[PDB]
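Researcher: Please generate the 3D structure of the following complex. Treat every line as part of one assembly.
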Amino acid sequence: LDSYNYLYRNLKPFERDISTENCYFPLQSYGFQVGYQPYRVVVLSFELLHAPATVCGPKKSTNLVKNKCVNFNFNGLTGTGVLTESNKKFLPFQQFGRDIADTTDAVRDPQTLEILDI
Amino acid sequence: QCVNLTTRTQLPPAYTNSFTRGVYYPDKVFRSSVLH
Amino acid sequence: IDGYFKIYSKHTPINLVRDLPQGFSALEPLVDLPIGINITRFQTLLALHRSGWTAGAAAYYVGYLQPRTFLLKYNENGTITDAVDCALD
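Model: Done. Output below.
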């Protein structure tokens, strides 16, 4: 599907710069025409736990249980314990609370938004 | 469809104090009774 | 930050006529738009009173953020009640 349409020219991580400046142009076209085989590569970058989850897998949800020792997986936030009711009134923006030493202690679950205490 | 308002009067900027306001929740995580 | 344009805000009724009242409060995160461009200059849209005729009133303060370390005391209700700038004095 691919065999002079591609060009190449330090730079910051994840930076993006499309610029042009023995008169030489910093662009350098490739001679597209087996070690020289062009490859259409892609890179997937993720930012885990920096925000509420948006994309997930095909795993189906489950009904929630209180006062029971269970192995839970809250939007990828795995853990083990008991889900109880808590007077910890979250403000409407934050999802899950943390104790010292960076451990998950409260969470609002999807489809109910109730503030469960782990 | 823009209008040029050359009538603006330009002067050196004024200044004032900021005191201690200007603090915002660094992250969307609930923390309680803790120094962070 | 890294292509995310974060908007924070908080509204408070105040008495002081022109400047910040002595007190402290924290701004909520609201929204963090995925806007992937660079910003280095900016402008404020304002309302002009046409009785061309112009007017305004009120006042808009601007300050410039810098890298800093801050100590914040989260209360029992999870609301930031005080903070300390680690490089103030």
